[PDB]
Design an enzyme around this catalytic site. Structure first.
Site, PDB file in Angstrom:
ATOM      1  N   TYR A  55      -8.957   0.790   0.032  1.00 51.56           N
ATOM      2  CA  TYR A  55      -8.340   1.946   0.738  1.00 51.56           C
ATOM      3  C   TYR A  55      -9.298   3.093   0.969  1.00 51.56           C
ATOM      4  O   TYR A  55      -9.176   3.817   1.975  1.00 51.56           O
ATOM      5  CB  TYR A  55      -7.081   2.494   0.050  1.00 51.56           C
ATOM      6  CG  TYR A  55      -5.955   1.485  -0.150  1.00 51.56           C
ATOM      7  CD1 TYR A  55      -5.901   0.293   0.602  1.00 51.56           C
ATOM      8  CD2 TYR A  55      -4.934   1.731  -1.069  1.00 51.56           C
ATOM      9  CE1 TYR A  55      -4.892  -0.653   0.423  1.00 51.56           C
ATOM     10  CE2 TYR A  55      -3.936   0.793  -1.238  1.00 51.56           C
ATOM     11  CZ  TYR A  55      -3.927  -0.389  -0.508  1.00 51.56           C
ATOM     12  OH  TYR A  55      -2.939  -1.304  -0.740  1.00 51.56           O
ATOM     13  N   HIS A 120      -6.360  -8.204  -5.117  1.00 55.17           N
ATOM     14  CA  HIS A 120      -5.707  -7.802  -3.853  1.00 55.17           C
ATOM     15  C   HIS A 120      -5.288  -8.973  -2.986  1.00 55.17           C
ATOM     16  O   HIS A 120      -4.175  -8.940  -2.432  1.00 55.17           O
ATOM     17  CB  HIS A 120      -6.645  -6.883  -3.016  1.00 55.17           C
ATOM     18  CG  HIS A 120      -5.906  -5.896  -2.159  1.00 55.17           C
ATOM     19  ND1 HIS A 120      -6.410  -4.655  -1.834  1.00 55.17           N
ATOM     20  CD2 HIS A 120      -4.664  -5.949  -1.614  1.00 55.17           C
ATOM     21  CE1 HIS A 120      -5.536  -4.005  -1.088  1.00 55.17           C
ATOM     22  NE2 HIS A 120      -4.455  -4.756  -0.968  1.00 55.17           N
TER      23      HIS A 120
HETATM   24  N1  LIG Z   1      -1.202  -5.389  -1.484  1.00 58.05           N
HETATM   25  C1  LIG Z   1      -1.132  -5.266  -0.148  1.00 58.05           C
HETATM   26  O1  LIG Z   1      -1.622  -6.303   0.656  1.00 58.05           O
HETATM   27  C2  LIG Z   1      -0.523  -4.096   0.592  1.00 58.05           C
HETATM   28  C3  LIG Z   1      -0.096  -2.980  -0.113  1.00 58.05           C
HETATM   29  N2  LIG Z   1       0.478  -1.888   0.496  1.00 58.05           N
HETATM   30  C4  LIG Z   1       0.783  -0.700  -0.371  1.00 58.05           C
HETATM   31  O2  LIG Z   1       2.133  -0.269  -0.161  1.00 58.05           O
HETATM   32  C5  LIG Z   1       2.148   1.040   0.427  1.00 58.05           C
HETATM   33  C6  LIG Z   1       3.342   1.263   1.383  1.00 58.05           C
HETATM   34  O3  LIG Z   1       3.301   0.396   2.488  1.00 58.05           O
HETATM   35  P1  LIG Z   1       3.975   0.737   3.967  1.00 58.05           P
HETATM   36  O4  LIG Z   1       3.850  -0.542   4.641  1.00 58.05           O
HETATM   37  O5  LIG Z   1       3.277   1.916   4.488  1.00 58.05           O
HETATM   38  O6  LIG Z   1       5.373   1.104   3.315  1.00 58.05           O
HETATM   39  P2  LIG Z   1       6.773   1.314   4.043  1.00 58.05           P
HETATM   40  O7  LIG Z   1       7.390   0.020   4.325  1.00 58.05           O
HETATM   41  O8  LIG Z   1       7.652   1.997   3.074  1.00 58.05           O
HETATM   42  O9  LIG Z   1       6.492   2.261   5.265  1.00 58.05           O
HETATM   43  C7  LIG Z   1       6.122   3.588   4.981  1.00 58.05           C
HETATM   44  C8  LIG Z   1       6.069   4.299   6.331  1.00 58.05           C
HETATM   45  O10 LIG Z   1       7.411   4.512   6.762  1.00 58.05           O
HETATM   46  C9  LIG Z   1       7.588   5.783   7.360  1.00 58.05           C
HETATM   47  N3  LIG Z   1       8.982   6.205   7.093  1.00 58.05           N
HETATM   48  C10 LIG Z   1       9.536   6.606   5.904  1.00 58.05           C
HETATM   49  N4  LIG Z   1      10.857   6.803   6.101  1.00 58.05           N
HETATM   50  C11 LIG Z   1      11.164   6.526   7.398  1.00 58.05           C
HETATM   51  C12 LIG Z   1      12.361   6.594   8.127  1.00 58.05           C
HETATM   52  N5  LIG Z   1      13.564   6.615   7.507  1.00 58.05           N
HETATM   53  N6  LIG Z   1      12.340   6.270   9.464  1.00 58.05           N
HETATM   54  C13 LIG Z   1      11.152   5.863  10.032  1.00 58.05           C
HETATM   55  N7  LIG Z   1       9.965   5.824   9.314  1.00 58.05           N
HETATM   56  C14 LIG Z   1       9.989   6.145   8.018  1.00 58.05           C
HETATM   57  C15 LIG Z   1       6.509   6.647   6.797  1.00 58.05           C
HETATM   58  O11 LIG Z   1       6.126   7.514   7.842  1.00 58.05           O
HETATM   59  P3  LIG Z   1       6.017   9.099   7.609  1.00 58.05           P
HETATM   60  O12 LIG Z   1       4.730   9.336   6.903  1.00 58.05           O
HETATM   61  O13 LIG Z   1       5.952   9.592   9.014  1.00 58.05           O
HETATM   62  O14 LIG Z   1       7.178   9.550   6.769  1.00 58.05           O
HETATM   63  C16 LIG Z   1       5.417   5.663   6.368  1.00 58.05           C
HETATM   64  O15 LIG Z   1       4.432   5.586   7.365  1.00 58.05           O
HETATM   65  C17 LIG Z   1       0.775   1.203   1.058  1.00 58.05           C
HETATM   66  O16 LIG Z   1       0.366   2.528   1.287  1.00 58.05           O
HETATM   67  C18 LIG Z   1      -0.098   0.472   0.067  1.00 58.05           C
HETATM   68  O17 LIG Z   1      -0.339   1.352  -1.011  1.00 58.05           O
HETATM   69  C19 LIG Z   1       0.671  -1.871   1.887  1.00 58.05           C
HETATM   70  C20 LIG Z   1       0.274  -2.912   2.711  1.00 58.05           C
HETATM   71  C21 LIG Z   1      -0.366  -4.163   2.128  1.00 58.05           C
END
Ligand SMILES: NC(=O)C1=CN([C@@H]2O[C@H](COP(=O)(O)OP(=O)(O)OC[C@H]3O[C@@H](n4cnc5c(N)ncnc54)[C@H](OP(=O)(O)O)[C@@H]3O)[C@@H](O)[C@H]2O)C=CC1
Length: 299
Positions: A55, A120
């Protein structure tokens, strides 16, 4: 507010992530907004931050931790060895092994240990890394015995990937398998949630809000709209609660203050069994996979 791992150690039941949205793309500059938001999250009541070598946000996490100054024992920090992608192209951690990578990351973090350390991705081979998948686990085992990681686990592992480790002669087994999991993705790879849960491996779910963030319009819109009205909770909240009711630890993230509080309120309410079950059923009508797309042949 927490799960209990296999070895009895506790893990807070929602995590704030520092990848996806915050994942550094061709720079190494400090992300000042992120550090800000991490402080807000911790002061609001988050006690579990999800990070990774790849990251580039580990410094931010350490600064936020230092600025807040919570008791160290009360915070749960996850980091992950950058093992590379499914091509085995050799583009991965710049360090010689996961033990040396965790050591370098601990310096970025300004911490003595992480609470959880993960492989990972499961693409490790001698030809691409100088060691195979089970020896990478062995490095994680050295880190654990030394005190550098309280717990160790894996991420994006299939059942066969888990069996590589469980079938070897090892000191301990993974306590976590962090996978993409949402109502539109109930099994990142076949039977993974069920097999892991039966073995006592905790599933952490990333991308839990897929249905709402990338899945609109789809069959859950009508269901979530109705439960939002009935519960007086927003759709994001309903989805995350639902993840928790499946026995899974949801990892989200946000840059918005109001969403910090929305997320932390998922422990103040319960979905009726019948409503939980309708999400799981209607979830299955559509498949949405945002990450690890080499797994898309399963959809
Ligand atoms: N091990 C792995 O391969 C992986 C691990 N991860 C980990 O998990 C974490 C979270 O993953 P992510 O996929 O981002 O998680 P989510 O599925 O929870 O999505 C989070 C995103 O949703 C948005 N959001 C929150 N609430 C709403 C709402 N009600 N309506 C619309 N949009 C909303 C946020 O935007 P806003 O900021 O605008 O609120 C944010 O960008 C990552 O940051 C990472 O740390 C992620 C991907 C792969």
């Amino acid at each position: 507010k927490e799960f209990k791992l296999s070895n009895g150690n506790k893990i807070p039941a929602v995590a704030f992530g520092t990848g996806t949205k915050y994942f550094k793309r061709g720079h190494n500059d400090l992300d000042k907004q992120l550090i800000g938001t991490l402080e807000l999250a911790l002061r609001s009541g988050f006690r579990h931050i999800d990070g990774a070598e790849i990251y580039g946000t580990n410094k931010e996490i350490g600064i936020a931790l230092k600025n807040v100054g919570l008791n160290r024992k009360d915070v749960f920090i996850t980091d992950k060895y950058n093992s590379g992608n499914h091509t085995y192209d050799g583009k991965h951690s710049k360090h010689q092994n996961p033990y040396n990578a965790l050591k370098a990351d601990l310096e970025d973090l300004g911490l003595e240990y992480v609470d959880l350390y993960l492989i990972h991705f499961p693409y490790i081979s001698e030809k691409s890394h100088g060691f195979d998948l089970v020896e990478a686990w062995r490095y994680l085992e050295r880190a654990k015995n030394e005190g550098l990681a309280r717990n160790i686990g894996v991420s994006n592992f299939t059942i066969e990937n888990l069996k590589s480790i469980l079938d070897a002669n090892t000191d301990s087994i993974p306590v976590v398998n962090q996978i993409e999991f949402s109502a539109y993705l109930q099994d990142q790879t076949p039977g993974i949630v069920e097999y892991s849960q039966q073995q006592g491996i905790l599933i952490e779910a990333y991308g839990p809000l897929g249905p709402i963030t990338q899945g609109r319009p789809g069959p859950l819109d009508k269901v979530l709209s109705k439960l939002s009205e009935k519960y007086k909770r927003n759709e994001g909240q309903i989805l995350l609660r639902w993840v928790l009711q499946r026995g899974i630890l949801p990892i989200t993230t946000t840059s918005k203050e109001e969403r910090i509080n929305d997320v932390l309120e998922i422990f103040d309410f319960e979905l009726d069994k019948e409503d939980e079950d309708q999400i799981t059923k209607v979830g299955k009508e559509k498949t949405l996979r945002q990450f690890s797309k080499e797994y898309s042949k399963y959809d």
